[PDB]
Symmetry: C5
Subunit: 78 residues, 5 copies
């Protein structure tokens, strides 16, 4: 998993079917400054420090048909 900071909001209106309710957030990984887009269900805001999981476990967390999501914010960091 990675520590990251939420750095922005991504909207994708023309998108494939099968994405659940939630938000696409830009995050910046701590120390490296690498960026990625992570899916969020907790309601995380810009500036928040978050913990991210990657790969198929981000998709398999969801009920219903597993979504084409490979990065999920799994918690907020205190």
């Amino acid at each position: 998993m990675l520590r990251a900071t939420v750095t922005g909001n991504v909207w994708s209106t023309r998108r494939i079917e099968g994405i659940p309710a939630g938000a696409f957030l830009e995050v910046e990984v701590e120390g490296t400054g690498s960026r990625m887009i992570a899916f969020d269900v907790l309601g995380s805001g810009v500036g928040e420090h978050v913990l991210i999981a990657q790969g198929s476990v981000a998709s398999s967390w969801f009920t219903g048909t597993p979504p084409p999501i490979d990065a999920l914010i799994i918690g907020s960091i205190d």
Copy 2:
């Protein structure tokens, strides 16, 4: 997921069986400049900014036999999307 820009189309001369309808697009990852080939079912265009998912979740989106695809464009990026350094 990654933001990328479509830079071109990849023309195959032959393929293994089991690849769905759709296109192989060359994309350039925003910020790193890294290139990869992503599968596209949306009719994405050259120059378009897109969102990509990687790994087995790209294949599992498809119905039927799991295709041998490890990168999928899942949408285009709206112009209101924003970014800022941490």
Copy 3:
């Protein structure tokens, strides 16, 4: 798998459902100095040398519903 050293830990109070009992530990990969957060169930202490597995095998190790975990400390290195 990678050799890593435990360097710290993460507290997360607001989390998605499905994180198992255990701790989020910060580890540094030996030789590279790259850092990540790995889940710990053994009781690895700060400074300890550990072995890490990554990706979905970190989640599927927990039997039952897959936790949204992509890095697991699987042992202490002698």
Copy 4:
């Protein structure tokens, strides 16, 4: 997926059970020059430009028990 060029053949005589029929090919990823070994079922030759998929999708392409393969040549370019 990645663009790569086949640079040679890899022979492995001592193997764990479950490798499918086919060949191990060394490839070089375009632009980065990174090398890896990919599995091939099409009969790709040295010098050929190919498209590679990585991770478990290389394995799950095969029907039946999952082979312990994490890179597959899925086409020629």
Copy 5:
């Protein structure tokens, strides 16, 4: 998959449950010189050239409960 050379043995003082019979070997990836730890069931020795598979296919090869293994030596290279 990766071409690598076995560079040594890795011993665990304490490990989680569910790891099959076999050895943890340190290997050096040939193109890069990068090192990693791979699981071995073939009885590979130091100095041997081996072929490695990474990720969930390293675990799903095994019978029984999914082992927490993300790198497996699948063969020796001639």
